Design a protein around this motif. Structure first.
Motif, PDB file in Angstrom:
ATOM      1  N   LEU A 148       5.502  -4.191  10.565  1.00  0.00           N
ATOM      2  CA  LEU A 148       4.821  -3.687   9.326  1.00  0.00           C
ATOM      3  C   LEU A 148       3.502  -3.590   9.394  1.00  0.00           C
ATOM      4  N   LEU A 149       2.808  -4.188  10.457  1.00  0.00           N
ATOM      5  CA  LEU A 149       1.450  -3.919  10.696  1.00  0.00           C
ATOM      6  C   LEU A 149       1.099  -2.455  11.385  1.00  0.00           C
ATOM      7  N   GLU A 150      -0.297  -2.128  10.954  1.00  0.00           N
ATOM      8  CA  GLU A 150      -0.554  -0.713  11.090  1.00  0.00           C
ATOM      9  C   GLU A 150      -1.399  -0.727  12.567  1.00  0.00           C
ATOM     10  N   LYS A 208       0.840  -1.083   0.044  1.00  0.00           N
ATOM     11  CA  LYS A 208      -0.059  -0.089   0.002  1.00  0.00           C
ATOM     12  C   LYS A 208       0.959   1.064   0.054  1.00  0.00           C
ATOM     13  N   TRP A 222      -2.071  -3.667   7.016  1.00  0.00           N
ATOM     14  CA  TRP A 222      -0.520  -3.710   6.735  1.00  0.00           C
ATOM     15  C   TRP A 222      -0.134  -2.910   5.436  1.00  0.00           C
ATOM     16  N   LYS A 223       1.304  -2.126   5.837  1.00  0.00           N
ATOM     17  CA  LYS A 223       1.463  -1.306   4.849  1.00  0.00           C
ATOM     18  C   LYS A 223       2.282  -2.209   3.767  1.00  0.00           C
ATOM     19  N   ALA A 224       2.969  -3.088   3.709  1.00  0.00           N
ATOM     20  CA  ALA A 224       3.416  -4.110   2.960  1.00  0.00           C
ATOM     21  C   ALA A 224       3.610  -5.360   3.481  1.00  0.00           C
TER      22      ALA A 224
END
Lengths: 144, 240, 233, 250, 242, 86, 241, 243, 244
Positions: free
Chosen positions: I55-57, D38, D159-161
């Motif tokens: 990496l998780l938001e 993303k 998740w960003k990536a």
């Protein structure tokens, strides 16, 4: 694990102890006494009625008899002025005979690490509270 | 439809799974039921030993099914909550259909039938909680103390306890409470009730809760400060 | 073979014949013995009535399904009550719709399907009850034996119960007797008394045991008991 | 017709976690490596197709389907279970939303309904859980760009990536070092081609690689413009011939 | 499994065969069927003086002229009692006449002879086999007074003198001798109390013993604690001379 | 080797009784039908028990009733404590 | 152990019962050959020859689901007829809800999901057969979709089954690499049928007569099966070369 | 192994043991045969005599589907009777909706899915018997045997049971007798002789002969049981051949 | 006893506890720690998160922090997937009382309904119970602030400060030692952050790994203020409390 025996071992073992009393008649000499945690799951034939006419049940000692066991282990122990023997007995609830000497051992090691002659009352308080609840604190589900 | 019910039937005629519902009483908190001439008192035990636990917002074992009928239980609060809800629905249905108030004898027949229907039918586990139903008959001041066992049977008792060390408390009830001449005064019934709880609570205050039921729909719970007033008189009687 | 294979009605044998079918026959041998026969005129069923003690009332093995029909139970009690009530509705359903009485040959076909429903599906108790169904229609007298497997076979006469081989053997000597006898119910009743006595060990010969019921072109199905059966005994 | 305990959902692991979850993540761990990223101005997802028989046609098997073209999807998990899940996801998204609001379903509501489908397989006895690992990538006007990962356990997290597959452990470190939040969609596409290539290097061409991105609304993809207000499809699937054009420039 | 779906290779069953153990472990129930009416009695088995014997009942009245003696688990028996009361009144709905006691017992067994859940062509109200057995008594205008035994397994039987419970095997041998067709109402009541006292270890009083009778004039009458104690005193006068 | 038939059991039972003493009034054709599916060993036990009945009663010879009494015994499923029946 | 008999996941995270569905596919040991031509689709399946007490005409592995639609099944024959009726029912009900000829790509999706529902159910067992659907699509032309018994479907240039499928797949793989096209020349469907027989004999190494094989034919707006005289006529022109 | 303990389980061989054991259960029953002629079919079954108390020629294992189709089976009698009653409601339901008799090749299609469903459900027990049926439909003479696995094929001759292969030796001779096949009446005498030949190992018990056939050139497509002089003629022909 | 029998929910153990229940809280204890705190001026709720991946938001998604309505706000400790149905069902029942009676639902009405849902799986049917720890923070005029804890049981127990999940006995000891009868809101925030720091193996205790939501009437300018605090504001709180 190491010694199993399979399903055939149950028949040749539990019935072998029966064949000792059932296979021989001894008037006054051999007296066989059997003991374990639970005798209900055992074979009723292994009980061999008529040889054992007495059934003895075990229960935990009450607070009146705990002072006799506690006084022996604390006879060689140095107690402070604020330590009372009647307090430790009241705190104990549903404990075995080894639990009486366990609190004296735990409270004795706390003062031994600090190099103290008379064990302070704080060690007796921490011993009776900790040994009370260690393994299973909660029923984990509902109130029972 | 799940299973037939309980298989193997057990060799002794009493299924172990049914016996586990009966043996669940001997461990958990104790509730000592008693009744006098003019009233009835159901004692209960709620453990306050756990710190930072609010005892005001936590309802005790005493629940009112009817205006003149209360309920006390010892066991799982989940299985007993259904017994409380289903009884109050029937308590209102009895007053709806028959227009008469809740009969103490008829109410226990339904409550025992709840545990019975779930035990007899398959796929539904039997309840592991036992309830003590005590109430007053219509236009009668004589208390009626019944009991609902998870096996599906009911019985009446003058003084009956449910909880750990119940055999020891039962001996305390027979040697003191007399069916022929029960204590007439309310103060004597409350003090002897706390004394029955001294063998379990083991010198405690918040763990003892006394609920006095009076006729003409009068029910009041003794405050923690009022309970200690009776405990103080008991401590003076121990030295006598 | 407890559990493992054949422990359930669905699981088959390595040979291919389910042992639960053979185990259901043993329930008939545990029950009371019932001897029966027929002819071109009447049909006689002789059922043995046992009990626990002298104070125990002798259980009647003969259940009346229809006015012109009759049966007997040598098997389990609960399995027959479901079948007796099922066959009871079939007699009235045939009289309500087809107006014709339930045929003995047609009753065994519908009864054959009822026994498989327990073995075809899972659960329930299969039907192992011995049933001897008689009746009188415009086709004559008929006796159709019901096996615990569900098979139905018509015979001149047979017997179901403990040591039924003794009563079946006596029917071989009389095979040419009761068939040729027509219009004489006296000889047909006496044939059933001596047939069951060969299989029995001679426990009690009194009139409270043997239950004789006869149906024919004149006298319909009637259950005789007490002084009624005391004439021959 | 009910047979005994056949609804039994008793299986449990000694550690307390559901044993069906660990066996589902184990199969996906060996599967083909997918991924997704993303970015600021767009969202890119990429995966490798299945070879199997050399005579198989890549146009038949599509690892990226379309629900409504505000959202993309890619799966490294069960092949057959994806077709059944999409069929049920659309019927739930149409009944609970399109039969009420009659619009494109939002991303937050659609992911919550997909998580229930995986739960109903675990809740209802006798039915095995879905072994699919879904990456739900969509763009709305509220949360903007959103990339969600729906695990076969039934839970979803943003998740960003992220990457799922055999090289999911190695690609997780690659996305941290190579990719940053300041990188845009064009920067994320090149990383998606390099990260996916490091999984299976046998064939890096566009025939075995299925690439799809969610960009700005394209009026040509909708097929009709009568209304300047109505937005076009945000999801655009890239042709394998277009993929090879970016591989030569990479 | 070894349930109703698993048939034993020896020609028997498991769950229902063991149900006779619950009958043998039940309370002692003794009754005698005569021409002057049936006298029924049971043992309530008081386990403590705090138990109220008037609230618990092991003898339930199904009809004015028909009553039963409940010895066994009260839970499994109460479901049959509610069906017995319903069937007895339902028969009065389509008829309004005195029903045969055997016909009423059969109607109770119609529900009591079926068990299980899954069935292709019929509904199942029950569930599991019950281990409780009752003694049904009554009176009609055909065969007179009758006494039965309620068996959930097989078909019921008509018993003139039957004993069930813990004292079943003990009192069965006594019913094969002292029983006679000429026993009067007074002789039948004194014989039940004499046999029940021998099979009972505790003392005989009105608390642990409750009896009832079924007659034509008074129907089903429950003996109170005052009259039951008087019948015990009459037994003491007979035992003093013997 | 299936179980002997009627005529097969009659000849086996007759041979084992050749060493005994009887009144020659015994008809084995009736006893062959009294024996239902008995093997070679179960037939030999008939003549053994038949001699024991006349031995305990003080009989000089073994009559036909001793063979019928010797064959009859419980075994089987008899003496049922099981439910159902009826 | 019990982990093989359970419908839920195994300790390896891989279902053994799905693998056991392919065990019954090799019982008949039938090698099917179907290729995608230009305007036509040729399907050839082996017909097992029983003794003289059976009718070889009634024995067929190819059934007609609908117009232009056909299916060849390699696996249990009794399990095939149960699956054949399921495809025929979905074919007629599709036209009542839409009204256009049901394409092969969608027919492979319906039968895959229904066979997959059996995998999820604890009572109904999965179909142990192989579903190969062939037809001539309007837009996509000839297409062959081979549906796996577990609900997976993908298109093939030339499908192959049985234990000898490795001989058929490899021999037809190099043939498609030389022409670099998935179709076959000679647009007339008469000679296209004969082209598949020669490639099948050379791959299997055994020449089969008219009674040892069955040849399905899928044309535009028509579907039929060559009889004994039509199959024998094909071997005549192949013999002359 | 443990694959036979549970119903409908895939074995490593590809077929369940209970399905394999269902085929062996047919050999434990009586032997039934059949002959497919040009204009019709012929059915010949065998009924065992339990004892001298059996009433001759009463119970008939031959079932007739509507008037135009006969149905016979072997192995377990009750398990095969329920399959016949299932086809009775299906042949009637098809006659109600489409107003026409059910064809023979499609008659197995309704029962094929029915028998196949019994091998799928766990709670439902598969069928262990084989069923032979036939008659004269609009398409002429047809003969099909329904296997317990749910499969069927066109059969120029039918054999099942213990003596099934002992009959196959005689059934294959009819192909060499005439290339066109035997007639309807000629097959009746040949089907009777096969019953006596397959009984050579069955001599421990007795038997009774039951023959039925349906032909267009005699009954005009109507199933009829053999009785009268036609039955005694076929028995006397088979009695002289076994000499 | 000898053999461990776990098959059906009807089967009872000699210990009286279903073996399916034995792993209910042990799976919850395997997840993060959720510690509720009930104060006089409000209720403070703090919970950590199980996901360790960077990496998780964690800013835009709250795993254990959910909002049932404007008043009742709970914290889910346990399996996240299995709890999704009971949460929406709670929102349905919460609106049912608001639909019929046109009044906001209290805590007791909501807990009694969610209690029978857990027992519904264990009582009837062969299904499994979904282990979830509900921490109920509501608002009530009659009893004031109410704080309850629902195990996968069907019963509720009142608590002033409760701790579930990992380090249950370790975190409860820190709460009972620092407990104050006054118990302000700002003090409840400090006791919540200092307790989670010692239980969590991470000594840094980053802001993104915590869920900070406070229900309080004691906010600035003496007004009733309700907010769901983003991790951006949580980082500034960790500096003021001395954690960072």
């Amino acid at each position: 694990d190491s010694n199993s025996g399979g399903e055939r071992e149950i028949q040749r073992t539990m019935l072998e102890l029966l064949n000792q009393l059932d296979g021989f008649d001894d008037r006054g000499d051999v007296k066989v006494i059997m003991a374990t945690n639970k005798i209900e799951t055992l074979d009723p034939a292994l009980i061999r009625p008529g040889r054992i006419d007495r059934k003895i049940l075990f229960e935990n000692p009450d607070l009146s008899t705990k002072k006799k066991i506690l006084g022996i282990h604390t006879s060689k122990m140095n107690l402070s002025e604020d330590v009372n023997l009647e307090t430790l007995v009241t705190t104990k609830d549903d404990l075995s005979g080894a639990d009486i000497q366990a609190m004296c051992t735990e409270a004795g090691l706390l003062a031994l690490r600090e190099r103290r002659m008379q064990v302070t009352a704080e060690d007796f308080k921490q011993a009776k509270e900790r040994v009370m609840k260690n393994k299973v604190e909660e029923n984990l589900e509902g109130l029972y | 439809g799940y299973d037939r019910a309980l298989s193997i039937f057990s060799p002794d005629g009493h299924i172990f799974q049914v016996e586990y519902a009966l043996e669940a009483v001997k461990r958990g908190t104790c509730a000592v039921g008693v009744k006098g001439k003019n009233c009835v008192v159901l004692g209960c035990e709620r453990r306050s030993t756990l710190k930072l636990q609010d005892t005001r917002i936590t309802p005790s074992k005493v629940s009112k099914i009817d205006s003149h009928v209360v309920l006390s239980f010892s066991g799982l609060n989940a299985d007993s909550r259904i017994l409380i809800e289903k009884a109050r629905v029937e308590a209102q249905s009895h007053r709806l259909t028959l227009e008469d108030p809740v009969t103490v004898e008829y109410l226990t027949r339904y409550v025992a039938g709840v545990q019975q229907r779930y035990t007899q039918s398959g796929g539904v586990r039997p309840f592991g909680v036992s309830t003590l139903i005590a109430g007053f008959d219509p236009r009668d001041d004589e208390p009626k103390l019944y009991q609902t066992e998870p096996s599906g049977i009911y019985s009446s008792w003058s003084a009956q306890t449910i909880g750990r060390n119940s055999k020891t408390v039962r001996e305390f009830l027979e040697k003191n409470y007399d069916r022929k001449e029960p204590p007439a005064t309310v103060e004597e019934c409350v003090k002897l009730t706390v004394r029955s709880l001294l063998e379990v609570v083991q010198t405690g205050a918040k763990n003892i809760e006394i609920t006095v039921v009076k006729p003409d729909s009068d029910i009041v719970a003794l405050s923690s400060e009022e309970i200690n007033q009776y405990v103080t008189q008991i401590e003076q009687e121990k030295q006598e | 073979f407890r559990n493992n294979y054949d422990g359930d009605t669905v699981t088959f044998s390595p040979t291919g014949r389910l042992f639960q079918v053979e185990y259901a026959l043993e329930a008939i041998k545990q029950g009371s013995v019932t001897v029966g026969l027929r002819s071109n005129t009447h049909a006689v069923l002789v059922a043995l009535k046992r009990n626990a003690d002298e104070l125990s009332s002798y259980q009647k093995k003969i259940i009346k399904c229809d006015e012109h029909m009759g049966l007997s139970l040598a098997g389990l009690a609960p399995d027959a009550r479901v079948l007796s009530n099922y066959l009871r509705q079939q007699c009235n359903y045939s009289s309500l719709v087809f107006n014709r009485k339930l045929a003995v040959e047609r009753a065994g076909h519908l009864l054959c399907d009822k026994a498989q429903k327990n073995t075809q599906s899972y659960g329930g108790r299969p039907y192992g009850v011995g049933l001897l169904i008689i009746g009188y229609d415009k086709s004559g007298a008929h006796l159709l034996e019901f096996q615990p497997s569900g098979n139905v076979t018509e015979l001149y006469g047979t017997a179901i119960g403990a040591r039924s081989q003794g009563a079946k053997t006596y029917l071989e000597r009389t095979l040419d007797t009761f068939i040729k006898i027509d219009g004489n119910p006296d000889e047909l009743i006496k044939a059933g008394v001596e047939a069951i006595s060969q299989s029995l060990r001679d426990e009690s010969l009194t009139v409270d045991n043997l239950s004789i019921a006869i149906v024919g072109k004149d006298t319909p199905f009637t259950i005789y008991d007490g002084e009624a059966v005391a004439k021959y005994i | 017709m009910t047979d005994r305990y056949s609804f039994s959902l008793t299986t449990f692991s000694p550690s307390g976690k559901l044993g069906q979850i660990d066996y589902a993540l184990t199969a996906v761990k060996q599967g083909v490596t997918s991924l997704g990223i993303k970015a600021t101005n767009g969202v890119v997802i990429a995966t490798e197709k299945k070879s199997s028989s050399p005579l198989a046609m890549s146009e038949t098997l599509s690892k990226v389907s379309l629900l409504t073209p505000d959202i993309g999807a890619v799966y490294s998990g069960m092949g057959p279970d994806y077709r059944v899940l999409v069929d049920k996801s659309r019927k739930v998204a149409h009944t609970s939303y399109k039969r009420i609001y009659g619009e494109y379903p939002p991303t937050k509501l659609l992911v919550s309904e997909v998580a229930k489908i995986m739960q109903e397989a675990t809740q209802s006895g006798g039915v095995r859980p879905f072994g699919v690992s879904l990456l739900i990538a969509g763009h709305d006007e509220f949360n903007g760009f959103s990339l969600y990962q729906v695990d076969p356990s039934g839970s979803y997290f943003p998740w960003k990536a992220t990457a799922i597959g055999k090289g999911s452990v190695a690609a997780k470190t690659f996305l941290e070092k190579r990719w940053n939040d300041e990188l845009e969609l064009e920067d994320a596409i090149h990383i998606a081609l390099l990260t996916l290539k490091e999984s299976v290097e046998g064939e890096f061409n566009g025939d075995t690689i299925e690439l799809a991105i969610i960009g700005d609304e394209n009026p040509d993809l909708l097929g009709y413009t009568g209304i300047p207000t109505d937005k076009g499809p945000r999801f655009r699937k890239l042709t394998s011939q277009e993929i090879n054009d970016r591989l030569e420039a990479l | 499994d070894r349930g109703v779906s698993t048939f034993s290779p020896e020609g028997r069953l498991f769950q229902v065969e063991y149900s006779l153990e619950a009958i043998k472990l039940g309370s002692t129930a003794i009754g005698i069927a005569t021409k002057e009416g049936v006298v029924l009695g049971v043992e309530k088995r008081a386990t403590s003086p705090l138990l109220e014997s008037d609230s618990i009942e092991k003898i339930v009245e199904i009809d004015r002229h028909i009553g039963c003696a409940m010895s066994g688990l009260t839970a499994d028996a109460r479901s049959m009692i509610e069906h017995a009361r319903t069937a007895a009144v339902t028969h009065n709905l389509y008829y309004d006449e005195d029903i045969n006691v055997e016909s009423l017992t059969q109607s109770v067994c119609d529900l009591a002879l079926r068990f299980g859940e899954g069935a292709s062509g019929e509904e199942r109200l029950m569930s599991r086999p019950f281990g409780v057995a009752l003694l049904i008594a009554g009176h009609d205008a055909d065969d007179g007074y009758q006494l039965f035994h309620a068996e959930p397994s097989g078909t019921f039987y008509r018993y003139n003198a039957k004993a069930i419970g813990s004292g079943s095997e003990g009192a069965q041998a006594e019913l094969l001798n002292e029983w006679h067709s000429s026993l009067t109402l007074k002789e039948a009541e004194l014989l039940v109390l004499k046999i029940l006292k021998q099979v009972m270890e505790e003392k005989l009083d009105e608390n642990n013993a409750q009896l009832s009778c079924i007659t034509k004039q008074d129907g089903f009458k429950i003996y109170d604690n005052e009259k039951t104690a008087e019948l015990i005193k009459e037994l003491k006068e007979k035992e003093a001379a013997e | 080797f299936p179980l002997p038939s009627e005529d097969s059991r009659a000849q086996i039972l007759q041979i084992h009784s050749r060493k005994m003493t009887t009144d020659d009034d015994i008809n084995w054709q009736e006893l062959a039908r009294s024996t239902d599916e008995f093997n070679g060993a179960q037939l030999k036990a008939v003549t053994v028990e038949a001699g024991m009945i006349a031995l305990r009663n003080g009989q000089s010879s073994v009559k036909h009733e001793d063979f019928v009494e010797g064959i009859s015994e419980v075994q089987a499923r008899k003496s049922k404590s099981v439910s159902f029946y009826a | 152990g019990y982990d093989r008999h359970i419908t839920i996941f195994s300790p390896e995270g891989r279902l053994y019962q799905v693998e056991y569905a392919f065990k019954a596919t090799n019982q008949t040991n039938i090698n099917s050959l179907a290729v995608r031509g230009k305007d036509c689709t040729v399907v050839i399946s082996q017909k097992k020859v029983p003794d003289k007490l059976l009718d070889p005409t009634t024995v067929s592995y190819i059934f007609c689901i609908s117009r232009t639609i056909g299916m060849v099944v390699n696996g249990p024959i009794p399990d095939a007829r149960n699956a054949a009726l399921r495809a025929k029912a979905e074919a007629a009900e599709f036209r009542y809800k839409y009204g256009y000829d049901m394409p092969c790509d969608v027919l492979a999706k319906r039968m895959a999901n229904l066979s997959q529902i059996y995998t999820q159910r604890a009572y109904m067992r999965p179909l142990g057969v192989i579903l190969t659907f062939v037809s001539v699509d309007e837009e996509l032309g000839p297409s062959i979709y081979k549906t796996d018994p577990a609900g997976y479907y993908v298109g093939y240039k030339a499908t192959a089954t049985g234990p000898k499928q490795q001989e058929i797949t490899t021999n037809l793989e190099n043939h498609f690499k030389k022409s670099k096209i998935d179709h076959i020349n000679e647009e007339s469907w008469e000679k296209v049928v004969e082209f598949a027989i020669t490639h099948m004999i050379d791959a299997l190494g055994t020449e089969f007569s008219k009674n040892d094989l069955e040849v399905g034919v899928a044309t535009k707006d028509k579907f039929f099966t060559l009889s004994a005289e039509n199959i024998e006529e094909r071997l005549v022109a192949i013999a002359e070369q | 192994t443990g694959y036979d303990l549970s119903n409908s389980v895939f074995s490593p061989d590809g077929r369940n043991f209970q399905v394999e054991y269902a085929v062996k259960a047919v050999e434990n029953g009586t032997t039934s045969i059949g002959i497919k002629c040009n204009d019709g079919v012929v059915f010949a079954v065998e009924k065992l005599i339990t004892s001298k108390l059996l009433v001759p020629q009463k119970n008939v294992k031959i079932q007739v589907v509507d008037r135009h189709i006969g149905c016979v089976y072997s192995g377990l009698i009750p398990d095969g009777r329920h399959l016949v009653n299932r086809g009775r409601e299906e042949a009637a339901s098809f006659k109600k909706l489409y107003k026409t008799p059910i064809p023979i090749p499609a008659f197995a299609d309704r029962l094929g899915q029915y028998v196949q469903a019994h091998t799928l459900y766990n709670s439902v027990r598969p069928f262990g018997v084989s069923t032979i049926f036939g008659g004269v439909d609009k398409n002429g003479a047809h003969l099909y045997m329904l296997e317990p696995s749910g499969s069927y094929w066109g059969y120029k001759g039918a054999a099942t049971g213990k003596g099934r292969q002992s009959a196959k030796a005689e059934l294959e001779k009819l192909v060499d007798h005439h290339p066109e096949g035997l007639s309807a009446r000629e097959a009746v005498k040949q089907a009777a002789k096969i019953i006596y030949l397959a009984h050579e190992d069955n001599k421990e018990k007795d038997f009774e002969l039951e023959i039925s056939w349906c032909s267009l050139s005699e009954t005009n497509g109507l199933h009829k049981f053999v009785k009268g002089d036609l039955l005694q003629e076929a028995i006397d022909f088979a009695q002289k051949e076994i000499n | 006893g000898s053999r461990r029998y776990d098959s059906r929910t009807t089967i009872f153990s000699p210990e009286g506890r279903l073996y399916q229940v034995e792993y209910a809280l042990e799976s919850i204890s395997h997840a993060g720690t959720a510690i509720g705190i009930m104060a006089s001026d409000g209720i403070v709720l703090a919970a950590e998160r199980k996901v360790t991946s960077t990496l998780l938001e964690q800013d835009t998604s709250t795993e254990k922090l959910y909002k049932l309505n404007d008043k009742i706000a709970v914290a889910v400790a346990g399996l996240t997937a299995d709890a999704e149905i009971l949460i929406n069902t709670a929102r349905i029942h919460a609106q049912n009382y608001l639909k019929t009676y046109n009044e906001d639902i209290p805590v007791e009405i909501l807990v009694r309904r969610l209690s029978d849902i857990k027992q519904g799986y264990t009582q009837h049917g062969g299904l499994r119970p979904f282990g979830v720890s509900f921490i109920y923070a509501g608002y009530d005029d009659r009893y004031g602030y109410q704080l309850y804890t629902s195990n996968p049981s069907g019963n509720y127990t009142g608590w002033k400060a409760i701790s579930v999940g990992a380090n249950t006995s370790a975190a409860q000891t820190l709460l009972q030692m620092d407990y104050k009868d006054d118990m302000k809101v700002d003090d409840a925030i400090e006791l919540a952050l200092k307790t989670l720091s010692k239980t969590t193996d991470s000594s840094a205790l980053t802001y993104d790994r915590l869920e900070f939501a406070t229900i309080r009437k004691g906010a600035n300018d003496g007004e009733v203020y309700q907010k769901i605090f983003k991790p951006q504001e949580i980082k500034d709180i960790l500096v003021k409390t001395g954690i960072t």
